[PDB]
Amino acid sequence: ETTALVCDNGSGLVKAGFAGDDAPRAVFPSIVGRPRHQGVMVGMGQKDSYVGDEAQSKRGILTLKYPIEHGIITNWDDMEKIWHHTFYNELRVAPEEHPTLLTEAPLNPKANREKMTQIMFETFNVPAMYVAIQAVLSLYASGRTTGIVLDSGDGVTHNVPIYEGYALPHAIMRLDLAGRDLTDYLMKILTERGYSFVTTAEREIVRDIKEKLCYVALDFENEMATAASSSSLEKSYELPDGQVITIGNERFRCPETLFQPSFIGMESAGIHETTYNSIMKCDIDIRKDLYANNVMSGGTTMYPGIADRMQKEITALAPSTMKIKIIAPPERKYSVWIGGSILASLSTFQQMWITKQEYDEAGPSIVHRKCF
Amino acid sequence: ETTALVCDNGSGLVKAGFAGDDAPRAVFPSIVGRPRHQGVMVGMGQKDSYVGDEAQSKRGILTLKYPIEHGIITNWDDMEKIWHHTFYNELRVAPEEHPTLLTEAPLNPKANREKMTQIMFETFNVPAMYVAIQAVLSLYASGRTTGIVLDSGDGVTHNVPIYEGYALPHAIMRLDLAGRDLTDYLMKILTERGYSFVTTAEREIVRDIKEKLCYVALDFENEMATAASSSSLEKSYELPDGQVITIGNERFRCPETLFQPSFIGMESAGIHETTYNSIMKCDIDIRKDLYANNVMSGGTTMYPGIADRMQKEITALAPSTMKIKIIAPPERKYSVWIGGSILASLSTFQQMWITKQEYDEAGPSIVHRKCF
Amino acid sequence: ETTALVCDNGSGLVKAGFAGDDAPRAVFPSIVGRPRHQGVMVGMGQKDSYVGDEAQSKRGILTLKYPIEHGIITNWDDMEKIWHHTFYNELRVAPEEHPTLLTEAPLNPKANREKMTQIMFETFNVPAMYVAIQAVLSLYASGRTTGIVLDSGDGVTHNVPIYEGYALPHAIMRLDLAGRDLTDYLMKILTERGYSFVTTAEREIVRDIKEKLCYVALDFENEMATAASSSSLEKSYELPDGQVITIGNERFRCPETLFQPSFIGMESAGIHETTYNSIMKCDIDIRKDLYANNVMSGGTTMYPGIADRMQKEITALAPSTMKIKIIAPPERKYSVWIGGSILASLSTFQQMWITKQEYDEAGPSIVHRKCF
Ligand SMILES: Nc1ncnc2c1ncn2[C@@H]1O[C@H](COP(=O)(O)OP(=O)(O)O)[C@@H](O)[C@H]1O
Ligand SMILES: Nc1ncnc2c1ncn2[C@@H]1O[C@H](COP(=O)(O)OP(=O)(O)O)[C@@H](O)[C@H]1O
Ligand SMILES: Nc1ncnc2c1ncn2[C@@H]1O[C@H](COP(=O)(O)OP(=O)(O)O)[C@@H](O)[C@H]1O
Ligand SMILES: [Mg+2]
Ligand SMILES: [Mg+2]
Ligand SMILES: [Mg+2]
């Protein structure tokens, strides 16, 4: 009768909530803020660390640290503070009477999963847990059983193909280019017009400009010629100190790094060629079902016009006799968590939990035996 | 008096030299490098393409491409540059006064042989050339006239049985599993410990780790239990940036792919079962000589302990009443070239060249009538 | 025959002269002074503006303005007067018969470059003009073709890595902390001893104290304990009004802001961590030629003992098994100009000038196409 806690601990945001729902209960950025100046006024609850939204609102006097870098946890006390805040302050539930479902990027280091096991069973100890792959949860949320997943979050962009219920681990591709790299590239190219941003409190502003003002160009050279020709593609955004900024071609030079990674010095191919090479690394007889079931998920797949560009590039790459259909649901931003809300609700899933007792015999190594 | 040129065009390395020698004169990787960044300094011989050791030493600013993949030439301008470099810069000879010996994997497409014919008679035009099968050259280097040759290089792995001078073309097996796939699998399994390698300049480093630290386990499960029990099978390697890495079971998980191709999602059987099925696709009365003269050659047969594992697996597969001998010469890495240094020096061979006037009479198609 | 005019327009000083020389002909501060009081004596050539050393000598009755702050030109009439004084009074040459070389900080706004081009081609119109990056000129002056440059001046501190003639623009780092902020921090800490300095005529005096009495401490806490223990680190300087001042620990507290930017409220990392993070933002293979060729140039890298502190911090940051070399030429204060005297004298450079007819063909937009 105890509900399961689905907790997607992504690189930029945390989506935590109960199983069986439609939307995540607590969505908050995964930052830990610490005071950087000196305190003069005595009293009024001057905490030494702020986690989440109060770190976001008080960000002018705080240095912000992300505990997760490219899907890998680096600072463990900060991630412990993140888990404590999302268990006791957001969901307001006791973790010792609820199973927990966690997500993990493919091709992660093993010690990351082992330390999640050790912390989750020795500090916020649970009756049981499970660790799942995010792309499988995306196919849960889409409702299909076949297709290839382009899941691009804040640190990790990965392609996973699954045909008729079976995963293909030899064609899973991973690229470390995601929305934090696009935020840094927007920070680099915003100095062309004179707008200088340095601090992490300015990184949040640059992230807000990236979410509210950027879109994917359909044709790159035609859009650059249109931007250089007439002044009709410039938008204005108001900073929190009152200055207005006006940006032009930088609206579509930021998400073009997703298709051309050579802008930031990476010699890897674009995500369209990554998807095409991941499809051609599979068996030949299943490629027809993979072309018609392109499913994307994540926060950086919500750009305006990315679906038409993806369709055009894959249609150029694929032979002309085949049907390529791109699936972009309007609720992809939480769809991985939505898969958790499907996965923990199934009665057949309720035997695959890693129990506390099984951990007590098997040590912190059973999670590679059970969870794939 | 004109010394013939033996030039082994392997998938990863090029071994070129004169006839009659004991060692190849020029051994260099078949890598074409191109600039990937922008150049701000003016002068000092900034070329647009680097070939060989110059591309290997300056690999940090270059995109590295292999012109040969799985024994099939894909890029022809790069392969022409490779031939120009190995004729005019390495061997320092004029190709118009020397006959040429070329090597080729079995079951190759014929258009590869026709285009190398047209190139070697129209751009670096020679008095004559011959194209030979590499397993025949390995059997020449062994000095025997019977036996099965397992030649495994950088792109291909082929088994050819030859009894008393007559090869059996219906029992020739080809597998597309070689050291490039072992390098890619070493990249895939090195992310378990957090060491991420993505670039081709890093792929050379992963190749160096594969050559200097990997070995074939005699028993797989006992070695995995020994690695999980104690940390006595862990070695350390120093990266060029000063960082050190430590690897454990990954020393023997990488070359186990040759015996179990299901690790990388290949459905085909291992190399021992391939040799066994190739031997009893021959006739019954010759199998005693084929079991007693099992010869390996190539760079990926230089793994420490691969011969004992091969002996054990063929001993298990064959009936126990007879003698199975695995012949691994210490110099097998260049032995195909050594076979060329035997074959181009024989006086009986000097009537089997494909001359210039024969090519002009019969087009670029006579290489299928003459060369087998 | 007509030599080029190399004019380093820095934030605090202007270094102008002819191409092919070893030292800059005219080195003068980039200030414009204006009268602030009323004049009762009529005659004697009372100008309404003083530029250069004339404003420096008569600075007691003038308000001094810098036209360039943080490498960005703000006042254009003052910068035009600076250019007119360095063309017609210091160099005493006609600008219409000499090509001009200009220097510019990386990650600069492009409107600065286009207004510089429009002014140089329509007011002091030239046959040709090229704009270069200062770190490239520093590597031209040092004579090598590889290494990372920490170029720190009066407005900007930037790190640029260049390997074998190829620059890496994705690893170029810029920090807006330079000698002006050190001068302001020296004013902020000089009120501890009762010496108050407010005006720009006092800014020149505080700058002179910073140049002739400050040095970089090796170990900060040990020199703080030495200054608090015994009176041995106090120096005396004579002000122009005859008063003497005595300073103690403030000799090394001022240049510690370059290593600890948190003293002036900036949360950015130190310049040693900036160099380290720029080097590990490059590729792995080229880091050995970057640790062995660390070059600095500019005025604020001329502190006593900054090279030893640099070597100690990068030695601590790098792995201990690898050599770090710090290169500080004695003539770094003009070395960027020295690179101009190398760059404009090469015969290979003479085909990359922006001509007058090219500018009239292509507008003021060719300068981003040609000059990187
Ligand atoms: N409308 C939008 N346009 C572009 N990018 C967006 C948009 N909304 C969110 N993002 C990006 O998505 C990233 C986080 O996506 P998400 O996958 O939900 O979180 P996580 O990666 O932590 O799982 C943020 O860094 C943000 O920059
Ligand atoms: N000591 C070694 N152990 C394992 N593999 C090796 C060793 N030396 C070379 N190799 C592998 O052999 C491959 C090339 O073998 P070789 O046949 O000599 O060249 P090619 O295949 O180009 O003819 C390389 O990819 C390398 O990975
Ligand atoms: N001996 C010195 N010690 C410390 N700082 C110095 C010294 N000499 C000059 N400087 C500083 O260098 C700055 C100017 O350096 P430079 O790079 O030559 O000029 P710019 O930055 O205008 O190109 C001045 O602001 C001055 O404070
Ligand atoms: Mg996510
Ligand atoms: Mg070979
Ligand atoms: Mg300067």
Swiss-Prot record, chains A, B, C:
Modified residues (N6-methyllysine): K81
Modified residues (Tele-methylhistidine): H70
Residue numbers spanned by region Interaction with alpha-actinin: 107-120, 355-367
ADP-ribosylarginine: residues bearing it: R174
Alphabetized UniProt keyword annotations: Acetylation, ADP-ribosylation, ATP-binding, Cytoplasm, Cytoskeleton, Hydrolase, Methylation, Muscle protein, Nucleotide-binding, Oxidation
TM annotation in the entry: none
Family: Belongs to the actin family.
A Pfam family per the record: Actin
Post-translational modification: Oxidation of Met-41 and Met-44 by MICALs (MICAL1, MICAL2 or MICAL3) to form methionine sulfoxide promotes actin filament depolymerization. MICAL1 and MICAL2 produce the (R)-S-oxide form. The (R)-S-oxide form is reverted by MSRB1 and MSRB2, which promotes actin repolymerization. Can be mono-ADP-ribosylated on Arg-174 by SpvB of Salmonella spp. This modification blocks subsequent polymerization and leads to cell death.
Further remark: In vertebrates 3 main groups of actin isoforms, alpha, beta and gamma have been identified. The alpha actins are found in muscle tissues and are a major constituent of the contractile apparatus. The beta and gamma actins coexist in most cell types as components of the cytoskeleton and as mediators of internal cell motility.
Name of the protein described by the UniProt record: Actin, alpha skeletal muscle
Entries under CDD domains matching the protein: ASKHA_NBD_actin
Record-listed E.C. numbers: 3.6.4.-
Residues with PTM Methionine (R)-sulfoxide: M41, M44
Location of N6-malonyllysine modifications: K58
Organism expressing this protein natively: Oryctolagus cuniculus (Rabbit)
Gene3D superfamilies: 3.30.420.40, Actin, Chain A, domain 4
PANTHER family: ACTIN
Record's function text: Actins are highly conserved proteins that are involved in various types of cell motility and are ubiquitously expressed in all eukaryotic cells.
PROSITE patterns: ACTINS_1, ACTINS_2, ACTINS_ACT_LIKE
An individual GO BP term: skeletal muscle fiber development
Oligomeric and partner information: Polymerization of globular actin (G-actin) leads to a structural filament (F-actin) in the form of a two-stranded helix. Each actin can bind to 4 others. Interacts with alpha-actinin. Identified in a complex composed of ACTA1, COBL, GSN and TMSB4X. Interacts with TTID. Interacts (via its C-terminus) with USP25.
